[PDB]
Each structure stands twice: as C-alpha cells, then as structure tokens.
Amino acid sequence: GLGQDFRMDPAKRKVNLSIGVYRDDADQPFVLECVKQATLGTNMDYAPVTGIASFVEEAQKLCFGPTCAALRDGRIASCQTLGGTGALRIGGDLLNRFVANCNRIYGPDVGYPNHESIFAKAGMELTPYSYYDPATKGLNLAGMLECLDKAPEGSVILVHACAHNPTGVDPTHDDWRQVCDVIKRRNHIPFVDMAYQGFATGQLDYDAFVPRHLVDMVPNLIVAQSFSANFGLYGHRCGALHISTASAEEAKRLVSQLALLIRPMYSNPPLYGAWVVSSILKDPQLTALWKKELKQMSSRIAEVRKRLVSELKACGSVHDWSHIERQVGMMAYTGLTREQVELLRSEYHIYMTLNGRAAVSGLNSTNVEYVSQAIHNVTK
Amino acid sequence: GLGQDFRMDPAKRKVNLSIGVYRDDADQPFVLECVKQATLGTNMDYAPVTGIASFVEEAQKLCFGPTCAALRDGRIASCQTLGGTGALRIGGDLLNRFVANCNRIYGPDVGYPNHESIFAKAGMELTPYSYYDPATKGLNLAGMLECLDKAPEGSVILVHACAHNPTGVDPTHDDWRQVCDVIKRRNHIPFVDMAYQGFATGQLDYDAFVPRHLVDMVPNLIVAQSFSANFGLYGHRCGALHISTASAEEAKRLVSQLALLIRPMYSNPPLYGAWVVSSILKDPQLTALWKKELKQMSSRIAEVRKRLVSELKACGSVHDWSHIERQVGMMAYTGLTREQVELLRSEYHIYMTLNGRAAVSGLNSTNVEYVSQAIHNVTK
Numbered sequence A, B: 001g002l003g004q005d006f007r008m009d010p011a012k013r014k015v016n017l018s019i020g021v022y023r024d025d026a027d028q029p030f031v032l033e034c035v036k037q038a039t040l041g042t043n044m045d046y047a048p049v050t051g052i053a054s055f056v057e058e059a060q061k062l063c064f065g066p067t068c069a070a071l072r073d074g075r076i077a078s079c080q081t082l083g084g085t086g087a088l089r090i091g092g093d094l095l096n097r098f099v100a101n102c103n104r105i106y107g108p109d110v111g112y113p114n115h116e117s118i119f120a121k122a123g124m125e126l127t128p129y130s131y132y133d134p135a136t137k138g139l140n141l142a143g144m145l146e147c148l149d150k151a152p153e154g155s156v157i158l159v160h161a162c163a164h165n166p167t168g169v170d171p172t173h174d175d176w177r178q179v180c181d182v183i184k185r186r187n188h189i190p191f192v193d194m195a196y197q198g199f200a201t202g203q204l205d206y207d208a209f210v211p212r213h214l215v216d217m218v219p220n221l222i223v224a225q226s227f228s229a230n231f232g233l234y235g236h237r238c239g240a241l242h243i244s245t246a247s248a249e250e251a252k253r254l255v256s257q258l259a260l261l262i263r264p265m266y267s268n269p270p271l272y273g274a275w276v277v278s279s280i281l282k283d284p285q286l287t288a289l290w291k292k293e294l295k296q297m298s299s300r301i302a303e304v305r306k307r308l309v310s311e312l313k314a315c316g317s318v319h320d321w322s323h324i325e326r327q328v329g330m331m332a333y334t335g336l337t338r339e340q341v342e343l344l345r346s347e348y349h350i351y352m353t354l355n356g357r358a359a360v361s362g363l364n365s366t367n368v369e370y371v372s373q374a375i376h377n378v379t380k
C-alpha cells in the first residue's frame, strides 16, 4: 500500500486516493450508529466452528432474501468466515467436494489482486475472461459472453456481485440475465464474490440480484459474503460463505466438510463482528437504521463521482469523464495513464496506484476541487 | 458431541468435565477484570497483514522476556495469528515451504487432537515420540529422550511448553534441560506450542522456560503463542507466531513470507483481542492486575485438583490419585477405564471423554464432593 509514502509526504496539500476503506466527508473512519447501538454477547467462549448460529442464519437471509426456495428447503450449506477473504479461501478449498476436475477458475481480466493467490493456495489457476474495456473504461459484455461460452463445460466462474473492484464497472441486471443464461447452458459453477451488498447502491435487494438470480438456475452456487464495508466492520473480520446444493442432505455433508477445513486453519471464528451483525439484523429498529446509513454511504460515493465529473467540466476539460458516474462503488478506473498518475503524485501529491485506480472514498467536499484541477492539468 | 448430550441430559444433578475453557468456582465463564478495564481502539480499519504492530511487540516481549538477546538484535520474525491454532498452521505451512523434505513432525504420543489435522493441511505427517506413561499417568522421560535422539537429524519436534493437553503431564525444568540438549545435538527444529503461559502455574517467566531456554541454543525456534486461556479471550481469536533466525535481515525476509501465507488465508487478523492484550501489557496497572488474576485462575485449578484427591481419600478410595495433583492445568488424564467413564455418565451423569480426560475447570466447590464419591464408587 502507498499509505507510507503519502504519510511521509511533507507537502501541505496532499490527497490519498489509494485507500481501501470508506471515509466520511471529513475524511474520518466511519463507525455506523447502528453498530454503536448493537448489543454484544457477555461470554467470550469459543463460537462453534461454523460460527455463531444466529449470525449465519441472518447472513443467509440477507444474502438470498425472504422468498428464496433454496433457503426454505435447507439446501444451502453455510458458515461464518474471516471476512469475504476467508469465504473465498474456504470456498475455494471446498470446491473439490463438488466440482469435477477442479484445477482452474475464471475471473474478470481486470480483477481483485488477492483473488489469484487465494485460489492458487486452494489448488486452482485463475484465468481471465474478457470484462473491462480500457477504451471506454466500461464493460465488454460481448467479450465476456463469448469467453464464458467457449470455456470448457463445468468451469468455475468467479463474478463480482456489484461494485467491481478495482474498476467500478458493473453489468446491468439486463446484462447479468444474459451472463447467467450462458453459465446455466454451459453447466458452469458460479462463484459470487459479494463484498458490497447494500454498500454499492444503497439497495440491498438490487445489489444481491446476481446470487438471488443464479440460485434457482444452477445445481451449485457459491457466495462469499463480506460484512466489512457494509457494516464498517473491516478489521473485525466478519463474513459468511454459502454453497447451494440439491438437498438438505447434500448441504449437511458440505457443512461437515467446511468444519474439517476451518478447524485446522483457525479453529473457530471471531465473535465481535458476528455479534454486531446478528444483533442489528434481528432488531427492526437497528435494521431500519442500518438501511438509512447504507444509503448515506452509497449516496456520498455516488455524489462525489458526479461532482468530480462536473468540476472537471467546469475546469475546462474537453475529455469524456462519464465513466466516473457510470461506475459504482469506492474504486474507479479513471483511465489516467501511468505517466499521468506519476505526475499527479510528483506535481500535486495526489496518490493513486499506477493502473489509474482511484479510491473515491478519499474524495470529499474539501479536496474534490483541487483533485479535479490536477486531473485536468495532467490530461489537457 | 458430549456437550450436546450433556446439555440434553434431563438429570438435575449432572457435571460436564469435557469442556475446553476456564470456568470460575460458580461454573460460569470468566471475563478478567483487566480485560474489562482495557482500552479498545476507536478505528475499525483493517490491521496490517501481520497484525497490530504494538500487540506483536508486546507478544514478543511477553514470550521471550524483555531482555532477550534475540529480541534486542531483531532476529525474531513475528506476526499476529488466529489464536495459537493459526500460529501452528502458518508455522507449519512456512516449514513445509522452506525446509527441504519437511513432510513430518514429531509430537507426543498422547497429544492435542487438532495438531494432527493442522500439520496434515501443511503437508506434514504427525508422528509420535514416547511421552505419556499410562501406568503412572505421568511422564516417560527416558522414552522421550531416546525417541528424540533417534529421530533423523533436522527433524521438527513439537513440544507443549506447559500444561500439556490432554494429560496435564509436564516435564520439570531439570527434565527440559535434558530434552533441549538432545534437540540441540541432533540439530532438530523445535516447534513450541505455548497455549497456557502463566495460566499453567501462575508464573509467567517459569511457564515460558522452554522457549526462553531454546532460543539461545538452536538456529531456528518456532513458537505458537495463544492468548485464549491466559487472557480469557478464546472467541476473539488472538495469538502470535514467532520464529527466531540468524539475523534481523533474515527475520525481516521471513516476515515477508508470513504475509504471503496470511493474505490468501484471511487478509489480516481481527482487531479486538490484539487491542485488549496490547492495552493491558502497556499499562502498569492493568499488567499487575492481569498477573494477579492469572495466579488466581491457576490456583483455583491446582486447588480443585488437590481437593479431588483429598475427597477421594475421605470417601475411602484405596487407589493412588497423586497424578491428579502432579499434573498441571485444565486437563487431567485420570486413568479411569472406558467402562468406568461410561458408568460415570450413565449412573452419575458426569461427562468425560472415553480416554479418561477430565477438564477440571468443570470441578468446583459445589460439585467436587459429588464427583469424588462417584469416581470412588466406579473404581472401588
């Protein structure tokens, strides 16, 4: 992380657009009011290996919603995990229990850096499908669909549910309907990384469209669910893993196998996050409060994207920045070149990674004008 | 399993001696006052991959002593882990990656069951050395020494620092001096599981003799350190891994390799327990209180062992129970036979595992007389 150089930078006017976590308009970490009001347990005894049971139940219901048949019929195997990262790893380690010939996983051509190592450790080579279009800083749907169609039948296909990291480029629900048809027809196994449900657009149901739509279409769906961003619980390491199966008996056999993976890795998961999420989701008042706060976070991110674009136009930039508003979530592929990123750092002390990814959570009312002028100056 | 059957058991007068965690004399979970008085962080941001730096620093000093030469020279590589379990796993994964033909590890013939699966996941087969003497319910030192001397040069040797789980049988410091001489002479790699420092005898320096004694004797010492029992932080999953090396340069490179193992496992470790331990160990008031609370927990366990033996004699048992007082910690190998354990359950509703292990943390002033009479009855 570029944090060290930013911190060491003596310049009076500097901006860190490399951060990985939410910040409010005052550039402060943001502890949710619903999290402050959550009730903790009183016992520090170990949780069960598969997690606090009420937490896992609420995580399932939040992921799949109130009218999910799979959930009703008990055919989903689930557990608490060490954030979304733990779910990706434990899920990856579980895949050979139900996927034949399981040595490859397909992910978007521009994707989340840690995915490669996670799945390598689990015995699978991450291989790309067409996804990001650098000319438009947007989606290459035709390319995605063709790659999925040509992949061997029974391939594992990694997809981001929403707020694609690092580009911010998300397919529409129309686009996802086409994607899921290919996944079903080719008998592929979807592995959904859902790290930003509710955080992405402020709408929990909309943001969970991809796992909810797939769970009825395929024999097995995997979902890695993170509570880091949407509850602001990052460092407490709170997530869940879900695998759908044909029957409650199949799900039970997979939960036993989950336990055999968890116990010799970390024995059992940390209490704090699970207490907080379970407390909030079982309380109507706290749940309502949480939903209001989700919208506050998602609206601020959306509005600062919109403000960046409008300020760029006000500065006199003649280039097109509409991708910044089309993209969703904290991470934006700006389209700035390596040279331009290097100039923003040297000349303006604005820090972002060399791929032109900007963490827009670092943008706010007090610096968006400065950053816009800088981006105009290095691109004009 | 047993715990479920216990909880399901209708019997009004029943005792669970199969638990894994400390209980006070009222049979309640026990949160330490020093933990209640600790100051938590305010920011829920992710910790560094290797953990909260102040916690890791305090963990090192607590393990090796503040004046440790290895520590002053910076030649110990350390990181925060998910309890002692995570330190065992990461340590094993590191050994198997970097030590040639490291596909085996030697552990005590009666040992902690999860050790076998932890090291199996790391690609290392756990194989026994003579340790427990069933005739005496005590130590077989000559057998241990002979086994360690015969193991191939450069073997990984797993040892419990104190409060051996599940037997309670510990070598004395005199004995450990003999063990460590063999380990040095044979160029073995010691892997110390220190799950109970201070919790074991109430004396933090005494309980850390094994790693402190070894760290100046061998080129590489590995220590898995748990804060679950000695801070009562079980479910918050707080531990540390330490690996000594020839130099600070080697240590720094090793820490880099730990990060490569951690990141695709769970990205970074949970804040809460690290906050608590760092807070306590940096505050003189909290540290002094913690030491007294540890002495009180350790003394309660020692005193109820003593009381079981004295009540067994009062009941009229003519058998020898001195092993119960010689053993150290929460776990006692009682020497009850399988049939005797089964009758304890069926006639007296006292629950132990069939190997005759009793968790004496489940014994207290309100049930020790009952349990003594029951144990007398089934062995007379």
Ligand SMILES: Cc1ncc(COP(=O)(O)O)c(C=O)c1O
Binding pocket: A020, A082, A083, A084, A085, A086, A112, A160, A165, A193, A195, A226, A227, A228, A234, A238, A239, B266, B267
């Ligand atoms: C796409 C994606 N997957 C997984 C993760 C890891 O999330 P967690 O902190 O819950 O492990 C992140 C968060 O940075 C992410 O952006």
Ligand SMILES: Cc1ncc(COP(=O)(O)O)c(C=O)c1O
Binding pocket: A266, A267, B020, B082, B083, B084, B085, B086, B112, B160, B165, B193, B195, B225, B226, B227, B228, B234, B238, B239
């Ligand atoms: C000997 C031993 N090693 C390791 C562990 C695992 O401890 P932790 O909860 O810190 O992962 C235990 C605790 O039960 C243990 O008894």
